[PDB]
């Protein structure tokens, strides 16, 4: 990344690189220059290929073999069991897209751009544009069905009760706030300010 | 495959050794700790009790496993050998990858 | 409702009531931590931003192809029509038309493929909504890591965000266990839970939470003599009826 | 142009866009804002529960396609039409 | 599904009547009116469109 | 160029099939290996053990 | 003789109050049969003599 540093490394794919004309390290995915090979292993930062990944040490670029994870051996015995004595609850976030932008394109203005003779020459090619417009309309119409089938699974609009006696649980960060004009929740508001075109 | 005339192939990120290590780790976890390691930290437990739990989930009482442990073990051992023999008989069950 | 949902994951409903405050505090801290983690960007929203970028880049690539030449003398149609006679302009108009039509066809095909991908993702999202939000899932890793309790949906500019609440065991201790207890020549098995020992005495405890009980005829059942079971131990069992019968004197 | 704007709200008949839909009054075309559904508030309390006392069984229908018509087109015959020189 | 297969098939059939810049959309007329060494340049432009 | 474009389109079509198969394989791994599926015919015929 | 067995494995037990529950009289249930049930408390009650 430019904001981190300016040092770069160059990879030549699929070349023995004895003929490629510092540090030169041979790799099964082709040798790379500007990197130092090390003994240690870490999680993959930048995938190179064939189990080799590169990362920034912090002031130099290094290449290493990937590490799958920490190794541990469970104490198996034929008369021993392990039982938990305490618990912790946790919250995780999962994100899924549901729809995309609806667009429509006309041939005549795109190809011909209001020219009359171009339109006369275009009509002898048949009905390509009827097919194209039908396909684009079919793409556009099914976008609304995707949003319709994910949400709107509840028939009636339930409202939150005025008193928040929920046994000590605090849902204020996810319940909607009537004061802010778009009537969204705090987290939902925080989400919309993070995505830009 | 072969490479020539402006087209090349690229090696995958994970080698076969790493995939084999992942499968071995999964197998060791599922034979030494049951389903516990999938939710959190692995908890060791003998295998006969785990077979008893799995029997109890399908609506069969756990007492019938202990009274028939040898028979079930023998049947499992015979089934594994039969599966090993079947693939060695050059049966074309691997068509999906070859296609 | 929390008491119901703990019963679904194989944990007795009582343990909620002695730990309600701790559970509520943990839930509030987890919500605050999710808020702080969402504030600190780590490319979590990349699954929407990449879709927006691939749509915009494809559209923009379609735009720049209008300036291509395709073998004509100039790409500006007005120059062609105002510079050459029609019978010689036609042999340029046709090739320009073919190039533009091919570009449009390629764009339409790419949009057709991307629409199917997005629709598959939307079907998965609807299935996950119906599964995790309106009920309590039993299939593992479908509504987050661990034993699923509930979920909450949130809106996104082109998607949906799920907040999964799960139950995770924290710290464990190990004990000596036995499959059955033999008393009076008869084998005993637990109705639920397993037999555990701290080295001197035997107890019955829950599946996923340490809570010992005295071995009693109430939570055990008998099936046959005990010589056949492998690894059986030799301990007594208590019956509550005998002290009551003795007190009837 | 040609639709009357009204205060009311109903389920969408013909989608227009941005929450606007059109329908036939039975005898003019009207335009209205979509109604998401009926509104009610549940009587929540910290010591109140509701238990059903009766039940009704129902049958629903769902339809799914499994296949489509098998077709085949001969490339040479379609393009050329049994033409030696064209072939 | 039935309609969207039928319309695609019908549109495929109808495309055979297009001209594609040739002097005639019927190939028999092309090879019955013209001498082949200048008729191939008429046949190819139908071939590409089809 | 037309040949290359046809090849690219065919690869793009096949990639979706490969991805769908991979997603099904991952779901089956998670449900049948890391737990005991209560769901019929998803992890083999009969009642699933492990 | 009548017994109680599991869903998927034959293992007949003696019908006992411990593995059965009572609800309503037997006039409404269609197909009910006429058989006795065992109560384990009576021998223990007799033991106090
Ligand atoms: C189980 O874990 C909880 C937290 O996960 C423990 O509760 C904390 O205990 C420490 C010990 O003094 C206190 O300082 C904290 O205030 C407690 N609460 C929190 C939210 O951290 C608890 O002690 C553990 N053990 C048992 C038996 O519950
Ligand atoms: C529970 O519902 C059933 C039907 O949903 C009720 O049965 C009906 O009761 C009315 C009362 O006069 C009769 O006219 C109908 O003939 C009954 N049958 C049907 C099919 O409608 C029943 O009364 C309700 N209550 C109880 C306690 O069962
Ligand atoms: C650049 O890196 C620094 C140090 O990691 C960081 O504080 C900063 O936010 C990054 N971005 C910019 C725009 O400076
Ligand atoms: C690169 O070329 C040299 C000289 O031909 C050869 O000795 C060497 O083995 C080659 N590298 C590899 C990885 O084969
Ligand atoms: C990595 O360790 C091996 C011994 O296992 C050694 O021979 C090699 O020199 C080490 N690599 C570096 C860069 O020091
Ligand atoms: C819920 O949390 C917010 C933010 O910390 C706080 O302002 C509010 O008072 C809390 N609700 C209750 C009932 O304590
Ligand atoms: C319990 O676990 C520890 C940690 O692996 C192990 O050393 C010990 O042998 C186990 N058993 C007992 C009885 O402590
Ligand atoms: C085991 O638990 C019992 C419970 O009363 C206790 O009396 C005994 O001392 C414990 N033994 C050990 C070794 O902790
Ligand atoms: C396994 O169990 C048997 C009895 O079932 C016991 O004799 C043996 O010592 C156990 N194995 C170990 C390593 O203790
Ligand atoms: C179990 O205890 C009984 C009590 O009399 C004894 O007869 C039997 O031999 C014991 N069995 C074992 C394996 O210790
Ligand atoms: C809807 O009602 C408001 C007053 O509540 C009124 O001002 C407005 O004109 C009405 N809309 C139409 C289309 O008449
Ligand atoms: C069905 O059961 C009834 C009693 O519930 C009995 O009278 C009748 O004979 C049975 N049907 C047949 C075909 O035996
Ligand atoms: C069942 O047995 C009781 C016992 O006397 C008798 O009164 C009753 O009539 C019997 N019913 C049938 C259907 O045999």
Residue numbers in the entry:
A (entry chain A): 601 to 621, 640 to 676, 690 to 828
B (entry chain G): 852 to 950
C (entry chain A): 901 to 1149
D (entry chain C): 651 to 676, 690 to 750
E (entry chain C): 951 to 1000
F (entry chain G): 1001 to 1050
G (entry chain G): 1101 to 1149
Copy text verbatim from the article accompanying this structure deposition.
We also determined a structure of this variant in the absence of any ligands to facilitate comparison with the scFv-bound structures (3.0 Å). A Cryo-EM reconstruction of unbound S-D614G with one RBD in the up conformation (3.0 Å). The inset at the top right shows that Ab 2-7 would clash with the “down” RBD of the neighboring spike protomer (green cryo-EM reconstruction, filtered to 6 Å). The D614G mutation has been found to increase stability of the D614G spike, which allows for increased binding of nearly all constructs tested. Comparison of the three structures (zero, two and three Ab 2-7 scFvs bound) sheds light on the mechanism of Ab 2-7 scFv binding to the spike trimer. Superposition with the apo-spike structure reveals that Ab 2-7 scFv would clash with the RBD of the neighboring spike protomer if it were in the down-conformation and therefore cannot fully engage its binding epitope until at least two RBDs are in the up conformation.
The spike proteins of SARS-CoV-2 are considered to be prime antibody targets as they are readily accessible on the viral surface and have an essential role in viral attachment and infection of host cells. Using this library, a phage panning campaign was completed using SARS-CoV-2 S1 and the receptor binding domain (RBD), leading to the discovery of anti-SARS-CoV-2 RBD antibodies Ab 12 and Ab 2-7. To examine the mode of binding of Ab 2-7 to SARS-CoV-2 spike, we initiated structural studies by electron microscopy (EM). We obtained two high-resolution 3D cryo-EM reconstructions of Ab 2-7 scFv complexed with SARS-CoV-2 S D614G: one with two scFvs bound to a spike trimer, and the other with three scFvs bound (3.4 Å and 3.0 Å respectively).
